């Protein structure tokens, strides 16, 4: 029923303490409303636990994201919209790890350059809400780090013990993804046989067979000539969790720096990116690579201010700007943002989020996304970058290794009536096994010279 | 000399095919431009699947002919 | 509803194209069988270059349409 | 004018001496008619010279040809019809080495398996003749190891000092090919850029561009994932040369064996393959991999007898049977040969020679070959093997890195009137730079699954 843990370390450098305290004294949107004394007790437990990631892996990610920023690699970021403790199981994790590897080999062939793989995993347990009371009149579900999905009042109370449950689930998952990435799942030939089974059994396989066959000949060629790292990420939302997981280490200049060891990279969402808020200030104090989500109310001028605050030393790949405009708005809204930022001399990664600007409620009462709109935003994103001569750096996608019925369309041609089949997401609709693979194939075509 | 006569026919069939392919691309463009001015997407996934499916009687190369016709109509992706 | 009308046209153009492609393959086969029974080669390199060249007005994809028509006529090589 | 060399070693094992003596006491067709005393003096010089090849390289070739025999690699053999001392220069050798490397990367991609590269080089200095008096009434030219190309009687006398000149030219050439194969010419990316320049400038480039582009994407993919041996061969024709270049070494069973160190592999031609003759018997005494040319008068029964005499220990890849039937005869004549040999349980390499069964004299007075007939024989060869379920193991082709005008057709559409432009071969017409590349592309299509 309950685990019991008793409460009964070296100080930070004086300047890092001052800066951390100042970041956390700024106002913060979307925080849990639990008591400060209970939060503090939970953070004290987390301050001594083994970290989810280590500094050397974060420094290595930074070097790989620098190549992406310079136009010599591509970033694939993907996973569940919301991880749940309930589905934090071996089959679910393996299914997502495999999906990401499958998409990555397809994208690598299309881009003709390395693909950096960042999973939404081992921490994606918190979400923001526009309304604190939902459609059933209950306090809103804010992810398993905060409260329960169950539609009852007791379940929806904010519960600080979920910080520690979140850590435990994150460690366990990350342990498995490390294991899985040094196993036979690694092998590029095994990973691509899955894609060819997908081509054989998919209703739209004829659309993708030529490209699947060409990839298979590239792999066999490589072998005829004599011839896996998955990073963890989540939205840095709950500051009690992120601050508890900070650790001091010597950074890429040999001086002690603060690393958030809850993940390798984190991003700041649309509702928490206040320029003078705690999330942006917290991002300025940590050594991790960071991303900021940019929606349709973004100005070129605010985008530059984010770049100058978050990438003050002009470190290629330290900052990612994640575009989510809507498929009908991206072609008009993005170019002015890109031009103004390019002119600063900084090298950010431009990443497309084709999911969050394109959501709508179906007549059957399910929030859903159409495949054609998702594809069209990624396409428009590539067009904006071709015209300006800039690098389309990656995609940020929400997916699952399960055959869910959540997003409309694809090869399966999922309808409004089919959405009830198994709509399993705890939050936003995921592209299923098939639809995620389809998009990787379509984006690989977009990447071709 | 049945070969010259038969090659004479293939020439006609190629002029005929070429002309229907040029036509199809212009019509394909006009459908894309109308949908886009009206706020719709560039491509329609389900419709491209219909187009692929109706060249399947040619065998394995049928889908590659359809995909090639789609490229002539709506262009290459991400361009 | 100009889209339905225009798509209605593309359907016709696809039925037209499909039928001329089936025809061309049958004629292509008959030229190959006549030449071979008479002791000649399976393929004629210079003639395939003429066929490729006369789809060049379609742009870069033109040669790939021609090569695909050649495969439907004389088959894949080494088979 | 002349180099001067004075004449003024351990005995073979008793059984190897007995067997060598017996092989050489058999009748031998197509031998030079120079005095025995002068031949002996020249062979004594060659018996102490550093060898052209070494035993360990021959044992390694055998292992690679075993894979070819088992259906897991492909053999490309090619070079000048006749090497001349006159053209044994750096540009000519480099041009041929590069042509072979260019064709090989194309074939490797098509076959989806390793390609073993064997050049007709560093020894292809002797040819047989059906007539001892040629069309000008002179004694026939028999290659630079025997006499001179020049149309005068003094030049056509058989000259035993050419055994030593042949060695000297062979060493020098082999030295350079070793150097060239460990240089930047090695790089697969450099080798394939030449093919793409060929595609860009060839009149028939549109025929090959899709495949060239697909290969380039395979190479870039290989590099995105984090990722040269040329063997010497010639027809073993002049027994004075081959016997002088024998050396004793421990073979693939640890017992002393005789290796012909004039090359890595040799073949026996149509006019010297008498089953009870010295060439076949000599081939039985050496440890090198061997090939036998099979023309349209070959019976399935004689083919088996060659296999049983030459591959008595059932060593995959030790024997190659080189088919040259004519494009109009290969489909009918080859299947019975292949079926009878497959049924013995031996694993020979089946190699296509599309050149020698397809030669004709043009109206302008030049011996020439049509490209369409060469392509058609290779094609028919593949069809024979598809139908029987056997492995089409390779091709044996005659080529040059120069833009010669010797074979009719190709992208350039070389005519009878164009053959006079620069017909440079000392013997049979070679496929030029462009036509050799074209055939590699066409054969790569034939190899596709
Ligand atoms: O909706 C359409 O009909 C048009 C034509 C098109 C084609 O080329 O056939 C088919 C489907 C769409 O992706 C594009 C291309 O727009
Ligand atoms: O000679 C010919 O005309 C026929 C027809 C063919 C074609 O498909 O067009 C063209 C050239 C040849 O290689 C083959 C295929 O034979
Ligand atoms: Mn989401
Ligand atoms: Mn020859």
Query: What is the residue extent of each domain of chain B?
Result: 1-79
Conformation bin of residue D258: beta by default, left when phi > 0, alpha when psi is -120 to 50: beta
Number of domains in chain D: 1
**B58 lies within 8 A of chain A by CB:** no
Backbone phi and psi for residue A290, each to the nearest 5 degrees, phi listed first: -125, 155
A12 lies in a domain?
no
Contacts of D155 (CB under 8 A, 6+ apart): D147, D148, D149
Q: Report the candidate in A334, A242, A353 with the shortest Cα–Cα distance to residue A293.
A: A353
Q: Which two tokens stand for residue B15?
A: 């002029």
Q: Report the candidate in D207, D36, D187, D221 with the shortest Cα–Cα distance to residue D98.
A: D187
Among C48, C49, C78, select the one facing D446 at the smallest CB separation.
C78
DSSP secondary structure string, D183-227?
STTS-HHHHHHHHHHHHHHSTTGGGTHHHHHHHHHHHHHHHHTT-
D199 lies in a domain?
no
Mapped onto helix, strand or coil, the DSSP state of residue D76 is strand
CB A240 within 8 A of CB A163: yes
B35 is in an annotated binding site: yes
**Adjacent-strand bridge partners of D398:** D79
Mapped onto helix, strand or coil, the DSSP state of residue A290 is strand
Q: Which two tokens stand for residue D73?
A: 């690699």
d(CA A209, CA A227): 25
> What is each CA distance from D204 to D208, D437, D440, in whole angstroms?
7, 11, 14
Interface residues of A toward B, Cβ cutoff 8 Å, are 203-204, 206-207, 209-210, 327-328, 371-373, 375-376, 378-380, 382-383, 386, 392, 409-411, 413, 442-443, 445-448
Q: Which two tokens stand for residue A188?
A: 């590029």
Report strand pairing: D230-235 vs D246-250.
unpaired
D357 lies in a domain?
yes
d(CA A181, CA D227): 19
> What is each CA distance from B41 to A354, B69, C9, in whole angstroms?
13, 19, 20
Q: Tokens 């190629």 belong to which residue?
A: B14
A131 lies in a domain?
yes
Residue-number span of the structural domain to which A341 is assigned: 50-181+229-449
Contacts of A431 (CB under 8 A, 6+ apart): A371, A374, A397, A398, A399, A400, A406, A407, A410, A439
Q: CA triplet D86, D92, D96: central angle to 5 degrees?
A: 130
Q: Report the residue count for chain D.
A: 449
The residue nearest atom 5 of ligand 2, judged by CA position, is C28
Q: Which residues on C lie below 8 Å from D200 (Cβ)? A: none
The residue nearest atom 14 of ligand 2, judged by CA position, is C43
CB A114 within 8 A of CB A393: no
- DSSP 8-state code for residue D131: -
Q: How many CA atoms lie within 13 A of A264 on its CB side?
A: 23
CATH number, domain containing residue A274:
3.20.20.70
Find the radius of gyration of the CA atoms of chain D: 21
D315 is in an annotated binding site: no
- 3-class SS string, A390-443: CCCCEEEEEECCCCCCCCEECCCCECCCHHHCCCCCCCCCCECHHHHHHHHHHH
Give the chain D residue whose CA is nearest to the CA of A187. D225
d(CA D177, CA D97): 7
Q: Which two tokens stand for residue A146?
A: 């905060």
**Adjacent-strand bridge partners of A368:** A360
Backbone phi and psi for residue D283, each to the nearest 5 degrees, phi listed first: -60, -30
Conformation bin of residue D350: beta by default, left when phi > 0, alpha when psi is -120 to 50: beta
B8 is in an annotated binding site: no
Mapped onto helix, strand or coil, the DSSP state of residue A133 is strand
Q: Report the candidate in D306, D310, D270, D268 with the shortest Cα–Cα distance to residue D286.
A: D310
A117 lies in a domain?
yes
Contacts of A98 (CB under 8 A, 6+ apart): A185, A191, A194, A401
- DSSP 8-state code for residue C31: H
Chain centroid offset of residue B76 CA: 13
Domain B1-79 grouped into CATH 1.20.59.10: yes
- 3-class SS string, D367-391: EEEEHHHHHHHHHHHHHHHHHHCCC
D24 lies in a domain?
no
> What is each CA distance from A211 to A190, A435, B60, D198, D224, in whole angstroms?
17, 16, 14, 25, 17
d(CA D87, CA A302): 71
Contacts of D185 (CB under 8 A, 6+ apart): D94, D97, D98, D101, D191, D228
Q: Report the candidate in A443, B30, B73 with the shortest Cα–Cα distance to residue C59.
A: B73
d(CA A311, CA A206): 45
- Chains in touch with C (3+ beta-carbon pairs under 8 Å) read B, D
d(CA D434, CA D143): 26
Q: Report the residue count for chain C.
A: 79
Backbone phi and psi for residue A119, each to the nearest 5 degrees, phi listed first: -90, 145
d(CA A286, CA A248): 10
Contacts of A242 (CB under 8 A, 6+ apart): A236, A260, A262, A266, A282
- DSSP 8-state code for residue C56: G
Chain centroid offset of residue A129 CA: 18
**Other C-beta atoms lying within 10 Å of the C-beta of residue B51:** 20
Smallest CA–CA separation between B18 and chain C, in Å?
7
Q: What is the dihedral of CA D9, D10, D15, D17, to 10 degrees?
A: 10
d(CA A322, CA A310): 14
d(CA A223, CA D221): 12
D193 lies in a domain?
no
Sign of the alpha-carbon torsion through D428, D433, D438, D440: positive
d(CA A426, CA B67): 38
Q: Which two tokens stand for residue B8?
A: 């004479």
CB B45 within 8 A of CB A371: yes
Q: Report the candidate in A83, C63, A124 with the shortest Cα–Cα distance to residue D204.
A: C63
Strand ranges (DSSP E) for D51-103? 74-79
**Other C-beta atoms lying within 10 Å of the C-beta of residue A48:** 8
**Way the structure was solved:** X-ray
**Other C-beta atoms lying within 10 Å of the C-beta of residue D21:** 11
Q: What is the biggest distance separating any 2 CA atoms in chain D, rounded to whole angstroms?
A: 64
- B and C in touch (3+ CB pairs within 8 angstroms): yes
D87 lies in a domain?
yes
Q: Which two tokens stand for residue A414?
A: 């999922």
Report strand pairing: D359-361 vs D367-369.
antiparallel
**What is the B64 CA–ligand 1 centroid distance (Å)?**
15
Mapped onto helix, strand or coil, the DSSP state of residue D25 is helix
Q: Report the candidate in C27, C43, C26, C34 with the shortest Cα–Cα distance to residue C79.
A: C43
Q: Which residues of A are annotated as a binding site?
A: 81, 120, 270-271, 293, 324, 356, 398, 428
């Amino acid at each position: 029923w309950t685990v019991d843990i008793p409460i009964d370390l070296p100080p930070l450098p004086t300047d890092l303490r001052t800066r951390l305290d100042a970041a956390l004294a700024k106002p913060a949107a979307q925080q849990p409303t639990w008591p400060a004394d209970q939060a503090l007790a939970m953070r004290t437990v987390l301050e001594s636990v083994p970290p989810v990631t280590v500094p050397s892996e974060i420094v290595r990610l930074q070097e790989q994201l620098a190549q992406v920023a310079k136009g010599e690699a591509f970033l694939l970021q993907g996973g569940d919209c919301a991880e749940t403790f309930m589905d934090n199981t071996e089959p679910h994790i393996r299914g997502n790890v495999r999906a990401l590897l499958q998409m990555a080999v397809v994208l690598t062939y299309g881009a003709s350059m390395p693909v950096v793989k960042v999973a939404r995993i081992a921490g994606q347990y918190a979400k923001p809400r526009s309304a604190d009371i939902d459609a059933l009149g209950l306090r809103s579900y804010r992810g398993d780090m905060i409260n329960g999905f169950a539609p009852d009042a007791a379940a929806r109370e904010h519960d600080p013990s979920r910080l520690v449950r979140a850590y435990a689930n994150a460690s366990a998952a990350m342990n498995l993804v490390r294991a899985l990435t040094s196993s036979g799942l690694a092998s590029l030939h095994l990973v691509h046989d899955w894609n060819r089974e997908f081509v054989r059994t998919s209703p739209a396989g004829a659309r993708y067979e030529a490209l699947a066959t060409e990839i298979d000949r590239g792999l066999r060629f490589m072998s005829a000539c004599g011839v896996a790292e998955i990073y963890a990420s989540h939205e840095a939302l709950v500051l009690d969790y992120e601050r508890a997981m900070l650790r001091l280490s010597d950074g890429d200049d040999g001086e002690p720096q603060l690393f958030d060891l809850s993940a390798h990279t984190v991003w700041i969402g649309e509702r928490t990116r206040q320029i003078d808020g705690a999330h942006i200030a917290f991002a300025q104090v940590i050594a991790n690579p960071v991303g900021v989500k940019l929606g349709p109310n973004m100005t070129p001028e605010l985008a530059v201010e984010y770049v100058e605050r978050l990438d003050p030393h002009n470190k290629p790949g330290r900052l990612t700007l994640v575009s989510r405009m809507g498929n009908h708005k991206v072609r008009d809204l993005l170019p002015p943002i890109v031009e103004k930022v390019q002119a600063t001399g900084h090298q950010v990664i431009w990443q497309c989020d084709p999911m969050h600007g394109n959501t709508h409620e179906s007549s059957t009462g399910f929030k859903t996304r159409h495949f054609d709109r998702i594809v069209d935003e990624v396409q428009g994103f590539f067009e904006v970058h071709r015209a300006l001569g800039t690098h389309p750096g990656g995609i940020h996608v929400e997916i699952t290794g399960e055959n869910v019925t959540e997003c409309l369309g694809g090869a399966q041609d999922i309808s409004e009536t089919d959405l009830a089949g198994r709509y399993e997401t705890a939050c936003d609709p995921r592209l299923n096994t098939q639809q995620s693979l389809e998009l990787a194939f379509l984006v690989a075509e977009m990447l071709r010279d | 000399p049945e070969i010259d006569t038969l090659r004479e026919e293939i020439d006609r069939l190629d002029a005929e095919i070429l002309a229907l392919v040029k036509r199809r691309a212009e019509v394909s463009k006009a459908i894309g431009k109308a949908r886009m001015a009206s706020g719709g997407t560039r491509l329609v996934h389900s419709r491209e699947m219909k187009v692929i499916e109706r060249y399947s009687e040619l065998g394995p190369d049928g889908k590659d002919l359809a995909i090639l016709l789609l490229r002539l109509g709506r262009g290459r992706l991400g361009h």
